Structures are given as structure tokens and as C-alpha cells.
Design a protein around this nucleic acid. Structure first.
Ligand code: HPA
Ligand code: HPA
Lengths: 338, 338
DNA sequence: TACGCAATCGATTGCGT
DNA sequence: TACGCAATCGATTGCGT
């Protein structure tokens, strides 16, 4: 088809090319003629032909976990923004935390020869770790670790620990001493990390959280429900609860409200993520806000760097969470005694 | 690189090829040798080289509006599922309801030569309509119209009208006669369509909704807030409100709760979408459920059809909404008089 | 029997004139 | 000056032997 244009415009295709990419000077008329032909033939040059020659497809692969989850969703849209903004195309793939699915996705990506890879798999067993290395040749950045687990990738790090710590303290400083927690999967950073940060703050306070008061969630609203329910279901109940993520949090609000418990008057609840619509939770949710957009953009940027500036040494950028006060938290019994 | 494999295995590349795609019989040993080389060289065959020859990239383009919105998000994940399931790769692009962005996205897609196109642009002005036709050559299906607006595409249709109608009736049959509505953008199907279905039911009932009682939303929680607020802010207030989408609905719950209004005891609220986490709204939201997954899959399927079975005649499949009773609705003053 | 030769898909780009 | 020739990127596939 490029031959077709050339022919119409009676010039070599080489010409057609250069004019199409202003890659060397071309006589006005000549230029015009080509643009003309280009238009009548209704010409769209093949990127694949081009990619074949130039050796990069101007496309990036996002090997994600799930894309419906608010948290996820939000990050993704960000990344997309950035890609578009710099001419990259997004290939979205969800491995659902399934090795086989992930091996598959990975392979198609290499095959389609994505310029770089954005990795957000949530959990990282050695088998997953291993696979990834097999493709160290393709530039990648993991956006979901607590610290850098490998030498062959870039990494953006969220400080989940300090975020949890922030959550504990607030509660502490607000009058609370009987607290409970519903964490996300321990096999994840946003799970374990948050918990542990939250647990340090407690030890520092000589606060002991009885095990009947800690209940694992899976970042899903339903899990949030069940936990809150198992917590308030007990003889002795905490006066405040720290919930690992806003959506399970939202799940937690439901239950309370269902047993006729009051928020925050009967229970204060503090979340984690500051998801786009947390403010509209009821009550408006107080939570730790995670920089999702920066989290996206920042990742894209390291990728581009390696890609263009051909860096080879893995890097790692940290990002920081921060408390957002809404109305799901109330003074605790010890506020006055501080 | 295919030459590299061949050489290692001392066979023509033609061989390497056939064994790689079991496209003709090959001596075991021969086969083995190639697999061997394939492994040592750590070989991944280029899809782009391949695509160049075979003429289809096994990739599909989703020209969407926004991907963070719950409704959207949910559909997208679906589509992705389907693509993966049949070896297609997803290129996600969000035009934000911006012509220029959409022209751009469209063009890159043609260029990257996507096998087909999934279209979800929300609003369709002639300029957008026009652009689309320009690419009638690439197979596409619009997943967001009320009826088929063009002869060059397939279309999946949701019955937003009958959905709205269902919403009105329920309210009617539940004792209500003073109702208000906060619709989404009229420039959209899920906006206008829902409204009108909802408005028919009302006329049929000889119910008149005073204009101070209808307030436009933009499908976003914030909009939901403001509207509900403007509605309950009045001297005379409805006893029931129909909200165009679950997220604005959620927005509506906030406000009420903020002015100390009760749901559903002071106001019944019925939504639209049955978004994944509507049940965990508080109270659990009664709403019309839209078949998102079928909406996805069904679209993918028409695409594949045109694609593979090389159909040429546009088709159109309808899908159906259905009421889901939760707890945001209460009997109205006229329930007993029916 | 089981395999290979050579042309081809659509672009780009180094030498030249 | 302003443009063109021919080789090339990595695969596939129709004829043959
Ligand atoms: O893995 C996760 N899933 C959903 N929401 C989350 N918020 C933090 N981590 C997660
Ligand atoms: O355009 C829309 N946006 C968000 N949610 C929606 N639910 C139906 N239509 C829409």
C-alpha cells in the first residue's frame, strides 16, 4: 500500500516515507502530491510493518491482577493516561493471581514484543518470581512490592508500613485502646505491610490486640462484612477498627449498620486507600490515602527511562501515603487522659 | 532469530516454522531437535513478523470512555476475559468523550491494525459518527446505543427504556406518587433512555413530576450528592427518588444522611446498574440490574463473528435489565389504596 | 517420505547521483 | 539540490524433489 501511494504521486515510496515522517527535506509540491495520494487512497501506514523494521512497537504491557477493583481500576486509568500522553499503546492483561494465566499473558506479551512491562501481580511466589526473570530482557517495573525483591526490575514502593503506623497512631491519639483489625491477604504488601505498620504503633503503645479481634479480609466488600460481623459478634468488642482497604471498609460499615451499630458513635472505623468514592461512603470515610496517580505515572516514567535512556541498573522510587480525616472516627475513652 | 533456531537444529527455518505451529508433519527427532534449539536459544517468535505475513494481529481495540467508573470497569473486565479466552489481546483506550483524543486513539488502532474494535463512547455527535464510518473497514461493534444508529456496525442494545419503566412502576406499586428523578446526561442512552422509560410509567399513572424535582447528574457521586440535596432542599419534597445510576445513588444516600434524612424511612431511593458493590451500600440498594458481563461477552461474540465468519451485514442483539429488590425502598402513602 | 527454496507481507534507511 | 535503489527486519507458504 505504501507502493500504492508512491505510484499515485509518481515518486518513490522512499519519498512517501520521508514525507510521512518528515525525516528529510522534500519539495513542497512533492510533499503535497504525496499528501494528496495519501488522502485519496485513504492511507494508514502499517505500524506492524514499521515496527518490524524499527524494532519497538510503541506499546506497553500491563500485567495486572484484576481491573474491576476500585483501587486497581484507579491506578490503571492513570497508567493509561500516561501512555497515551507519550504515544504508547496499552495492552491490558489480568492474570487473576493464576500462574498459568500469568505465564500465558507473559508469553503473548513477549511475542507481541511490548516495549516494556508494568507488573502488578499482588502476590509473588518463587515460581512467579522465576518466570519474571526469564524475561528480564524486556524492561519492566513492579508497582506492587514493599521493597525491591529482585535485581532485574525497577520498583516503585508505597510505604504501606508507615501508612499502617499512621492509622494506628491516629486511633491511639484519639482515645482508643481496644482496637481490632481486618487486614488484607498477608501474601501481599498492602496486606502484611499495612498490618505490621499498624502493629508497631500498638506495641509502642503497649496495646495488645487479642486475636479474636483480628480478622483476615481479601480486599472485598463481602469479606469486610463477615469480619466486622465476627468482631462485633463477640461478648467483648473493640471501640475502634482499622480496616485494611476502603472497599472492605465499606463492607464493614454495612454489617454494623445491619446489627444496628452506629458509626462512628458505636464503632470508629478507619480505612485504607482513599478510593475515589470513599468520601461518599456513609459516613464519609476517614482513611489513609494512597497516591495512586503518582504511583502510576511514576512507574511509567521509570519504564520510559530504561526504555529510552537504555538504563540497565534497576532503580526504585518511594511514594508516600497520608492520613485523610473524614467522619467515621470518634474520640475514644482515653482522649481526655492524654 | 528463527534462522538462528533452524541453524542450531540443522534444518530449514521452514521446518522450524511447521514444528512451531504443527502445520504439517515432522519427524520426531527433527521435531525434538527444533524444540531443543528453541529452548537453548530461549526463542520467542515475533508476532509482529507473523502478523505481517498472516494479516491479522489477534488483537482487539476497546475505544472506551473512562475505565475507572464502576459500571465501565465492570464491563471492561468482562471483555478482557473473553479476549483472553480466545487468544485475543486487549488494547484499552479511553477517549474521555473528546473528539481529538478519539480521532487519535482511532488512528493508532488502525495503524496497529487491530483485528476488530469495541466501541463505548457514551455520547455520539455526528462528528464522532462520521469518523467511525471512515473506518468501517475495520470490524466494529458499539456496545452503548439504544438502537442501531448506523448501518456499518454491529450493536448490542440494553433496553434502558424498559429498565426505567420498571423503576417507575415499582415505585408506583409501592405506594408512591410524589417522585423525583436525577438522570444521567441526556446525550447518552443510559441517560435519556432510562429517563424516558421512567417517564412513560409516570404518565401512565397520571403522575406529574414537577420540574423542581428532576435534577441532572453526570453519573458521578458528587452529582448525586448535589441533586439529592437540591431535591430535599425544597419546601415540598418527594417521598421517593429514582436515581439514574448506582454511583450517583450512592452519592444521593450521603446527602440525605447528612441532612439527617432517613433511608428509606424518610426517602426511598431506587438506583440503576446493580454495580458489584451496591449491596454493600447502606442501606443495601434496590436497583435495576444491568447485565454487564453478557453485555461484554455478547459484544465480543458479534465481533469475532464478523471477524472470523467474515460477516458484512450489521447485526444487533438486545439484552435485558431486571429489578433487584434490596432495602432502600419503602411502602408509600398509597400502598393500601391499591 | 519428509523436508527445503524462494517469494512475499509493508514498511525504513544507507549509499549514491 | 532533491530524490531514488536495493537490502533488510522475521516470519509463512506454494511448489517441488
Ligand atoms: O490487592 C488489593 N486489592 C484491592 N484493593 C487493594 N488496596 C490495596 N491493595 C489492594
Ligand atoms: O455513562 C455512564 N457512566 C457511568 N455509569 C453509567 N451507568 C450507565 N451509564 C453510565
Amino acid at each position: 500500500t505504501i507502493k500504492d501511494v508512491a505510484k499515485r504521486a509518481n515518486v518513490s515510496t522512499t519519498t512517501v516515507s520521508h514525507v510521512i515522517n518528515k525525516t528529510r527535506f522534500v519539495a513542497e509540491e512533492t510533499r503535497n502530491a504525496v499528501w494528496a495520494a495519501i488522502k485519496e487512497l485513504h492511507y494508514s501506514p502499517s505500524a506492524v510493518a514499521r515496527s518490524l523494521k524499527v524494532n519497538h512497537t510503541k506499546s506497553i504491557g500491563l500485567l495486572a491482577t484484576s481491573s474491576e477493583a476500585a483501587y486497581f481500576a484507579e491506578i490503571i486509568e492513570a497508567v493509561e493516561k500516561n501512555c497515551f500522553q507519550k504515544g504508547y499503546t496499552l495492552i491490558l492483561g489480568n492474570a487473576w493471581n493464576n500462574l498459568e494465566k500469568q505465564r500465558a499473558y507473559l508469553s503473548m506479551m513477549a511475542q507481541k514484543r511490548v516495549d516494556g512491562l508494568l507488573v502488578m501481580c499482588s502476590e509473588y511466589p518463587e515460581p512467579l518470581l522465576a518466570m519474571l526473570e526469564e524475561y528480564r530482557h524486556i524492561p519492566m517495573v513492579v508497582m506492587d512490592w514493599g521493597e525491591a525483591k529482585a535485581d532485574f526490575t525497577d520498583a516503585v514502593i508505597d510505604n504501606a508500613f508507615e501508612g499502617g503506623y499512621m492509622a494506628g497512631r491516629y486511633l491511639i491519639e484519639r482515645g482508643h485502646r481496644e482496637i481490632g483489625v481486618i487486614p488484607g491477604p498477608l501474601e501481599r504488601n498492602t496486606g502484611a505491610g499495612r498490618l505490621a505498620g499498624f502493629m508497631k504503633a500498638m506495641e509502642e503503645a503497649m496495646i495488645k490486640v487479642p486475636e479474636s479481634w483480628i480478622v483476615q479480609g481479601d480486599f472485598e466488600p463481602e469479606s469486610g462484612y463477615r469480619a466486622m460481623q465476627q468482631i462485633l459478634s463477640q461478648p467483648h468488642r473493640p471501640t475502634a477498627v482499622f480496616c485494611g482497604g476502603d472497599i472492605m471498609a465499606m463492607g464493614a460499615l454495612c454489617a454494623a449498620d445491619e446489627m444496628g451499630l452506629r458509626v462512628p458513635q458505636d464503632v470508629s472505623l478507619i480505612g485504607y486507600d482513599n478510593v475515589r468514592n470513599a468520601r461518599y461512603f456513609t459516613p464519609a470515610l476517614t482513611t489513609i490515602h494512597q497516591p495512586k496517580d503518582s504511583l502510576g505515572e511514576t512507574a511509567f516514567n521509570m519504564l520510559l527511562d530504561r526504555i529510552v535512556n537504555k538504563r540497565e541498573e534497576p532503580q526504585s522510587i518511594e511514594v508516600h501515603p497520608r492520613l485523610i480525616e473524614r467522619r467515621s472516627v470518634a474520640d475514644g475513652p482515653f482522649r481526655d487522659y492524654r
